[PDB]
Amino acid sequence: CRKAGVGQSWKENSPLNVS
């Protein structure tokens, strides 16, 4: 876990959708 309810488990380098 890291800030968001996921922790960068997408494609990576600058994520989106805060809440």
* The 3-state secondary structure of the chain, one letter per residue: CECECCCCCCCCCCCCCCC
Neighbouring C-beta atoms of residue 18, cutoff 10 Å = 6
3 near 15, Cβ under 8 Å?
no
15 near 4, Cβ under 8 Å?
yes
Give the N- to C-terminal CA distance of the chain in Å, as an integer.
Answer: 16
Q: Copy the structure tokens of residue 16.
A: 């989106």
- Rg, Å, the chain Cα set: 8
CA–CA distance, 10 with 12 (Å, rounded to integer): 6
Checking phi first, is residue 15 left (phi over 0); if not, alpha (psi -120 to 50) or beta? beta
User: What CA dihedral angle connects 7, 9, 14 and 17, to 10 degrees?
Assistant: -80
CA–CA distance, 17 with 19 (Å, rounded to integer): 6
Q: CA–CA distance from 8 to each of 3, 18, 19 (Å)?
A: 9, 12, 15
